[PDB]
Amino acid sequence: SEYFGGQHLYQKLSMYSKTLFLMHNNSLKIYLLLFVFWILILLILLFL
Amino acid sequence: NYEHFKPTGKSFRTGLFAVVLPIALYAWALKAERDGREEKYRTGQVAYKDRQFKFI
């Protein structure tokens, strides 16, 4: 029950929160680069 | 007791044969009996005065 329940839900949410803190430990240039790619696919499709 | 629990094959066999299988067999039996009585009720094979549990 706690597996497929509250304890394993808390463990999976703690693991998902721990693995998302590694996304936020990077420099600003990586996230701005991700925005620049999202502009880049949005302009490639404007050609097509 | 959750801290010493791991999803092994023995635990899966115990949780299947202890809980889920009697629930599944009982639900299948209840659905089969109610469908067999309900098709006889909806078809019209039983009389009005000869039906069990009239709540009378």
């Binding site: - | 069990q52 549990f53 009239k54 709540f55 009378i56």
Partner: protein, 48 residues
Amino acid sequence: SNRIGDVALLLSIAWMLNYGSWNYIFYLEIMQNEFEMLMIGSLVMLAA
């Protein structure tokens, strides 16, 4: 050993639901031949 008698009276009441009044003495000599009253009699015989 008497709780099984309690649940047998409970099921006997649940099958005397068919004839309504649980005063069985007015329906004994009439419905001695019915399957529902045979179920009632089997449950109350198991109870005794």
